[PDB]
Curated annotation (Swiss-Prot), chains A, B:
One of its GO terms (molecular function) is metal ion binding. One of its GO terms (biological process) is tRNA-guanine transglycosylation. Homodimer. Within each dimer, one monomer is responsible for RNA recognition and catalysis, while the other monomer binds to the replacement base PreQ1. It is an enzyme of class 2 (transferase). This is Queuine tRNA-ribosyltransferase. The active site is at 92 (proton acceptor), 267 (nucleophile). Residues 248-254, 272-276 are annotated as: RNA binding.
Amino acid sequence: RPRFSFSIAAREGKARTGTIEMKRGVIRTPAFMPVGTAATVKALKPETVRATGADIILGNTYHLMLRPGAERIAKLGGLHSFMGWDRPILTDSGGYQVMSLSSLTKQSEEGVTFKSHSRHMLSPERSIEIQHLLGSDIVMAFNECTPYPATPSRAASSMERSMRWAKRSRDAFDSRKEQAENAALFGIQQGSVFENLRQQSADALAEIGFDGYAVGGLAVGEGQDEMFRVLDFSVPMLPDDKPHYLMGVGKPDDIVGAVERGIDMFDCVLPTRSGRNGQAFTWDGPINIRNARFSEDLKPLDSECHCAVCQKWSRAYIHHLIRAGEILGAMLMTEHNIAFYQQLMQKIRDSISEGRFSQFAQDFRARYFA
Amino acid sequence: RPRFSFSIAAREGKARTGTIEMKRGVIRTPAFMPVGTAATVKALKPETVRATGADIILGNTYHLMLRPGAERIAKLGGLHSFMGWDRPILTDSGGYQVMSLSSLTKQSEEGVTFKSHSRHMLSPERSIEIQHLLGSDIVMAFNECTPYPATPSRAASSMERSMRWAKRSRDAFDSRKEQAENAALFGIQQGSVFENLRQQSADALAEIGFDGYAVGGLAVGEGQDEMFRVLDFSVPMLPDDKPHYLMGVGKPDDIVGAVERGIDMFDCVLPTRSGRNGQAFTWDGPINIRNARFSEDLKPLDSECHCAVCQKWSRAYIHHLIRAGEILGAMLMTEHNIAFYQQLMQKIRDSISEGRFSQFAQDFRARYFA
Ligand SMILES: CNc1nc2cc3c(=O)[nH]c(N)nc3cc2[nH]1
Ligand SMILES: CNc1nc2cc3c(=O)[nH]c(N)nc3cc2[nH]1
Ligand SMILES: [Zn+2]
Ligand SMILES: [Zn+2]
C-alpha cells in the first residue's frame, strides 16, 4: 500500500532484518534479487521465480533501452505487464553496463554517448526517463562506476561527477509526478577503496536525500578481503534508517559477510549463469553437476533443499540433461540455485531476528568450506 | 488397471475415438504423443507436458541406449522415474533412427551394427531388452524402415526381413514375463507405397498377433498426397479392433487427414522443434513469431487457445524472447505448440464422438489454409 516504507524488525551487530513495503509488494530484507536483464530471469517463468521466494527482481536500463526499447515497453504497458512479473522491480541506471558492455564510449559532464553492442546517449535525465517508461518500482540514480584500481585523484573526480549526476537524477525523478508518487529512488555511493572519498560521497548523497543507498564501485575485481575492508567503513557512513544495497554481489560467502557489515539488498547473475553452466549450490559448497561422479547419483542436488527440483529429480538426471545440452537442464539448475539463494536469505533473516546470526554465519562457513 | 485395453467409443467413416487403458494411465484416442527423445520433452517439465493434455509421450531406444545408456537407466529405476513422467511411454525400437542417424551401418539377418554419432549392435532381441530396461509401456517391434523411393523388389525383401524381425520381437517380448505382464507390443507394417506388399505385411503381423499396429515407412519424403494414398488402402488391412499408430506424423493437416483414414496415434517433433525455431501454431495457420509484424502485437499467440502461455503473455513478449535467444522463449513457444496439438486432438475426439468430424475437418481446413 505505501510507496516505500522500510522497517527494521531486528538487529545483531551491524546486521539488520526487516521489510520494505511498496505498492506492488513486500520485500523481506536482507533480500536477494534475481537478475532479469533481458526482461526475463533466464530459463524461469515469473511464477517460478516467485515460487523460489523472490520478492523483487532486477532489470537493466542499458539492455532494455536497446532491446526491445523503453518507449516500446511503455507502449506495451510497462515492464511488469510485458514480462508478467507483477511484484517490485529494481532497475539499474545504465551507468555500469554502459562502461563494461559498450564497444565505444564518450564521457562528459552531460553524460555518456556510446555504441550499441547503433549510437545512443545516457544522462541522469534520460536514465530516469527510461526507468519511468519501464515502470520500475526502485529507480537507481545514474552514475559512473569507477574502474578498479584507480588513483585517489581519479576516484575523486569520478565520484564527484557521480554526485552531481545524483542530484540531477533526484531532480528528474521528482519532476515526474507519477514516478515520485509510485516509485522510489536510490542513490549510489562511490569513492573506490578510499575512506575519505566514500565519506564525501555518503555526505553528498545524504544531503540530497534518497529512499535507499547503494554501495557501488565494488565487485569490480578487488577481491573479498578488500571488498569487506571497504564495507567495514563505508556502510556506517550511510543513513542507518534506509536500506543498504550492495550492487553486483555475489557468492554466498560474500552475501553473509556483507550482511554482517550492514547490507540489506543484493543482486548477482551467479546463481542463474553458473546454473546454466552446470554449477549447483549446496550447503556443502558448490558442485559441478557435469562431473562424472554424479552420473549415477540418485540424491537430489542438495540434501536439505526444499525446492521443487530437489523434491523430484536426481543429480544423475540433471547431469544427463546438462551434458546433453538440454534446455530442461538449464531450467532445473536455475530454479534450484535461485531457490538455494532465497533459502540462504531466509536463514539469514531468521537467524538475525532470533539473535543467532553470528552462530549461523560460523556454522554456514564451517560446512560450506569443509 | 489393465495391461492394455483398447475400446472404441464412437466412429465416423473410418475415423474412431476411444481409449487405451494401461497400468500407468488412460490414453485418449486419437492421441498425440510429444516426443521426448533424450529423456526430456524439450524445454518442458513433465508436469507441463501433462498440463497441455498429453496422456503419453514417446521415447527412443536409439538415443537412450547411447546416452545415458539402458542399463544405467534401469539401475536408476527406469525411464519413468529417471525423467519424472509417471504415465505411459511408447518407445520406438531403434530401427528408423539407426538408419537416419548412424554415421556408418551394417545390415544382416541378425540385425544392424552401427557407429555412434563408438560401435553398437541392434537386433530384435536387443531392442526388446533395451525397451524392457527402459521400462516402456508400449514397446515397438524392431524393424527396418524402407528408404523412399524403393523398387518393389527392394521394398519386398526389406518388408519380409522386418516381418521376420517382428516374429523375433514378439518372441523376445513374450520371453520376458515382467514385460509381457505389464507392457504392450506393437507391430510395424512395411511395404513402402505398394499395396500388395502392405497387405502381405499386414497379414504377417496379424498372424503373429500384436496389441497395436503401426503404419511405418511413411513420412519419409513421399509428400501428403502419396501418404494419404497409401493410408487409404493400408489402414483397412490392419485389425480394426486394435490401435493404429502412424509413425512420425505430423503437421496438423496430416493428422486430420490421417484420422479420416483410421489412424489413432501420432508422434512428431514438429511442435517442439518448430516451437524452438519461432514457429507457433494457430487456428489460422502457423506464424513465425520472429517476424517484425509481431514486435508490438499484444494479442496472445492464438486468440482461442486455452493454454497458460496464451492466458498470460503477448506475441510481442515472445517475439522479444525468441529474437534475444532467451530460453524462456523456447519454453513458452513449446508449451503453446504442444497445447495447440492437444487441443486439436481434443476437437478431433469430440467431433468424432458427436458425429460431426467431417464438418470439423472441413471447418478446420478452410480456416487454417485461408
Ligand atoms: C558485478 N559487479 C557489479 N559491481 C557494480 C557496481 C555498480 C555501480 O557502481 N553502479 C551501477 N550503476 N551499477 C553497478 C553494478 C555493479 N555490478
Ligand atoms: C518422421 N518420419 C518418420 N517416419 C517413420 C517411420 C518409422 C518406421 O517405419 N519404423 C520405425 N521403427 N520408426 C519410424 C519412425 C518414423 N518417423
Ligand atoms: Zn533444490
Ligand atoms: Zn496457447
